[PDB]
Amino acid sequence: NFLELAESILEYFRPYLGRIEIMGASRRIERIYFEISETNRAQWEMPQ
């Protein structure tokens, strides 16, 4: 229910919610969430 109510926020922040997986200090795979800047994404998308 909370996710459905936050659908608009999640859709708006989808291009900026960066997600990766790492092998953490606990010897387990951990998912990391961070912020991708708009300038960073645009520079990445530049054709060169």
Partner: protein
Amino acid sequence: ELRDQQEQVKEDMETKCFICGIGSDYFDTTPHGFETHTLEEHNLANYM
């Protein structure tokens, strides 16, 4: 040989994850599993 190199690169990218090396066959046990894994879980652009 050049055509074979191009085809091999395409096949490798389309059948195995660039980061963890697990093959698509495993992820595809879930619908569009490989696509979701390579676009949301282990996206290399996200590591950059």
